[PDB]
Design a protein around this nucleic acid. Sequence first.
RNA 1: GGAUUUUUGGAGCAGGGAGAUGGAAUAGGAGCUUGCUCCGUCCACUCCACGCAUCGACCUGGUAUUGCAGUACCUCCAGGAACGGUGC
Lengths: 90, 82, 162, 74, 74, 79, 71, 83
Amino acid sequence: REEEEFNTGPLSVLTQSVKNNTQVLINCRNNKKLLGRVKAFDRHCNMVLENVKEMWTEVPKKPVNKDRYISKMFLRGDSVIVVLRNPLIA
Amino acid sequence: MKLVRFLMKLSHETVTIELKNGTQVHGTITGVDVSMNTHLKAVKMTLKNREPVQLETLSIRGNNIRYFILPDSLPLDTLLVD
Amino acid sequence: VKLTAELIEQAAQYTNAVRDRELDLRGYKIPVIENLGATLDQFDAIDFSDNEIRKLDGFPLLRRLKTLLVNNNRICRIGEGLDQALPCLTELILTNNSLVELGDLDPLASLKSLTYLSILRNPVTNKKHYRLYVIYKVPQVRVLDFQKVKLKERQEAEKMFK
Amino acid sequence: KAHPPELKKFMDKKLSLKLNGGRHVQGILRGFDPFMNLVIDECVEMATSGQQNNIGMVVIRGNSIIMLEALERV
Amino acid sequence: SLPLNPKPFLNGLTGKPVMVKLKWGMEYKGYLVSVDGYMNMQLANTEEYIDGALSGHLGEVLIRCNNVLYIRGV
Amino acid sequence: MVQPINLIFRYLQNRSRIQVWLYEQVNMRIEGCIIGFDEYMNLVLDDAEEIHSKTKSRKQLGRIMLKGDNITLLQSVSN
Amino acid sequence: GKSSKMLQHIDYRMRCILQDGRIFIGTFKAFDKHMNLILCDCDEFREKRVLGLVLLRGENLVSMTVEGPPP
Amino acid sequence: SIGVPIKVLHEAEGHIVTCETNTGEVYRGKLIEAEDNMNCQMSNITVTYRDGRVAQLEQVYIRGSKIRFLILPDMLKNAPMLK
RNA sequence: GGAUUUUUGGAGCAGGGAGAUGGAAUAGGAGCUUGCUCCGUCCACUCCACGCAUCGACCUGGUAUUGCAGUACCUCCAGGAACGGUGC
């Protein structure tokens, strides 16, 4: 019931990220896009990823864009707004 | 399957937690509950456009935590086995 | 009976009538106010009434200290480093003290946040033009000896000794 | 669990409800709901300029309900 | 016509080019591939639209129910 | 006592045009004919139109599946 | 497991930070599953506001830390 | 099934208290009805908001969804609230 | 045990326009220092649309109440508006 819904619904789009070890992008509510490989997921979209690259844009408070890299991180499913899977690892 | 059992087994590790308001608290994770109640000891918190402050203890809720940051030497492959 | 860390840790601390955290240190007869670092600036008011303190100095940096009760004491001199140790000191009750000259009120001008000052029952208040000198030296104080400072008193303080 | 709100005394009474975004409506309640949904028959909403516009029978959900003040003595 | 529940309407909308607009103003247009019971959407060959102008193609896009505001079948 | 679910069922049976206001958004609302509903207040509007009160414009979309978490107030219109 | 994270700070003065930027320093007496804090004789800092016994909801709580020794 | 702050709020019904909402509205008065879901229904209530628009109403009802905090008197903080 | 009152968030972002107005001590680029010219970041004043209206706290003057209580807040008139939030 739960496994078939996870392997046949939208969560299968997450399950293709951890099985085939592909890179996907996650756009959050803080105007930040983190591209990385999804290592661990759950039913509440708790994404524990490794080797992530987060890019955004900031103002001095003209503005300018910036980016950074993290070895391993974990983000909750509440702040995850958009999740895009694209063949970028090849 | 359940991320709460993986987060509860990450005790005695120096991690960081970034909230939704831009405040980043870096400290040693000492207590994790089922509701992701992060109780840390000897933490350092830096808010948005403010000075970092060191506290002996801190208790952050699970709904207020936006992102987490773990060290690179964390055994994520061994801790994932239930 | 000097003020130590064990006397401050065994002293009672509660909420005052103005909903502020006050520690009752009365009845100790401390000759010098010291060893106040054990409170760790967790008290909003200090009740040091009925003591034998001679100089109001030797206090560490406490940003939460806003009220200081030094009534029924023998305070005759004020420290010059009062602003560097209490930047948020707004209430200072120095009634029935040993202040005789107005020159002891000269280190009290550094407290810019001080608004309520009590210098009643003192020989310095019996001198000529003591209230005008206290208004001229400390313009930030709004209430002096339970009396509101008016514009005419400020003009009289700014006219003389200009 | 799932206890309904105590809205039996405010039944068929003219009350003013406040909604999120700074919205104000006034009308007579015609029922209750466990999800804090209120049906206001012949409701009148206050605009930004101050004019009242009659919208008729409307349904207000509990997710945006701020405060309901009864204008009649119950 | 007949009153249709939203769950068979979401089950029958799979494979058709629709557009889901979020509360932030951005919309994703593409073919609906997966729709579960928790109102989650997963599309393929998605295109982003912001303020009436196209942004770019992303491919397979997953949108949750907490951020998606509306959906229109084109 | 009039239930809101019974009023929504009567509005779906009458097939009248209703306007739905969004939560924390007073500039833009929706308007259409509700065909069906569910337990999560999910409305299915046929030939729906988004009306912007600031720009005084109306953009039609068609069949729209509006969630119940965003609709704050719903009123019945004669148009 | 032990669930002694909230019981160790019982009957102690703690300062909780709100979501809007307010700070309530009060004596935590009891809690619940919804993190409802009851702060008896609490002060509001952002200026000092005399509040007293303030029962703040758990939805507006962000972080909490120890303030000082218990009275 | 009933919390200790919920029991303290239910035991404080009938006293002059106040409830500050998330938007800043402070409904003050006698707590006539206090349910388990922080539903505060008061009679002869007074509105003193963060906007400052102070008025007097016959009856007010504030739900627990937009309720930020509650200011209660210290008459029930001694017993049986001592645990 | 992610679908309205608590914990998988409806949050993010920007402060109206103009003027041969004024400043970046040590911190912009280009015309490849210094002097000058141009352009995507503030504060002070002036003008239009003191951004607008509201109530609360608050300061000056005049004025009324002499009253034994456990408190959102407490007389009224006029001027000024340093502060808070609400809707446009």
